[PDB]
Amino acid sequence: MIVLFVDFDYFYAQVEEVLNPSLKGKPVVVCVFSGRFEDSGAVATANYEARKFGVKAGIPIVEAKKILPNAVYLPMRKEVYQQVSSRIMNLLREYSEKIEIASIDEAYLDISDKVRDYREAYNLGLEIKNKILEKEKITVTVGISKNKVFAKIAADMAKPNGIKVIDDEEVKRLIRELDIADVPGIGNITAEKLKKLGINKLVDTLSIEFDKLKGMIGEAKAKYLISLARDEYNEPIRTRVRKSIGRIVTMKRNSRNLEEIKPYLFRAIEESYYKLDKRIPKAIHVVAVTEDLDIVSRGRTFPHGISKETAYSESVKLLQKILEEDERKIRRIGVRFSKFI
DNA sequence: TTAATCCTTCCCCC
DNA sequence: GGGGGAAGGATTC
Ligand SMILES: Nc1ncnc2c1ncn2[C@H]1C[C@H](O)[C@@H](COP(=O)(O)OP(=O)(O)OP(=O)(O)O)O1
Ligand SMILES: [Ca+2]
Ligand SMILES: [Ca+2]
Ligand SMILES: [Ca+2]
What we know:
CATH topology of the largest domain: Alpha-Beta Plaits
Distance between the termini: 35 Å
Bound molecules: 2'-deoxyadenosine 5'-triphosphate, calcium ion
CATH superfamily of the largest domain: Reverse transcriptase/Diguanylate cyclase domain
CATH architecture of the largest domain: 2-Layer Sandwich
Helix content: 25-40%
Strand content: 15-25%
Number of strands: 12
Order of helices and strands: EHEEHHEHEEHEHEHHHHEHEEHE
Strand order of the largest sheet: 5-6-1-7-8
Largest sheet: 5 strands, mixed
């Protein structure tokens, strides 16, 4: 096994500089304006000009403007980026059938055959890096290692616009010196629970009796960390499948009044069906994000497909189920369609 | 402070 | 006991 991971640099922000180079060299911040008040919303992402100064992903637009009041702030255009990704996702296909598109900007390539070792592999990196830079004018970072997890870690270490190879020897000094919080699939909450167990390095998972671990962070997540620890992790590069689509919208003012919410709910359903594109779900779920930012949801599965008229009808009833079941106020509302026929 | 998949209960019933 | 499918909360990105 030899995995080659590609992960695009400051993607949205970069795609924006690609569509107006004049931006190149200036702090660019890509926002998601909630429109609940002048400059309300957060930062989807920003290029490095803006990051060394603090402006990172997730901070309020307002807070970001206090730091870099004179940086280009642009409204996110997912679609445009979504299309740019697709094109880049093809150049990559041409480099290996066994390909796994992990997200809008990540893809794992199994070049086990194509290449015969890390020398030739690392060269295929530059070859791929360079080709994407030429065809679409985008810089990316390449990680290469024994398995996907490490191939991804390799990338995290080489960015921005870089390439790195993690060889079995390094894999080992990592299975020992890598910070458990930097292991893919281990978010904050799990990284925390693993702290109270004394597990600070991938290795520590070997000293704890499975059941205690299986009881603290779920079974699968447990067996997963172990294999990574005993260098036995080796999952295949499979072409993932969209198992559910949905959209959510923030409202102008929080609310409880049904009629007051419906219009939004529907706006969500409209957008959601359009995305489906020929797909037909058997499952629908209404998702409400309350004023205290906690999430609540309710849904129903049908023994057949859902037509738009059905979605409308059934979603309103499920929203009523939420409002009833919850006394707080609703800050956001959306729907999710899944279980596609 | 702006999408999707995983994990653990339920509940039906051989 | 345990397959098998639903539902909803919990996490990760
Ligand atoms: N709060 C947020 N709101 C919206 N999008 C977000 C938020 N936080 C993160 N994102 C998105 C922003 C990006 O589009 C996507 C992350 O891109 P990501 O792959 O993690 O790194 P990147 O490689 O493109 O950035 P970097 O320059 O650090 O390498 O996550
Ligand atoms: Ca990326
Ligand atoms: Ca991390
Ligand atoms: Ca990502």
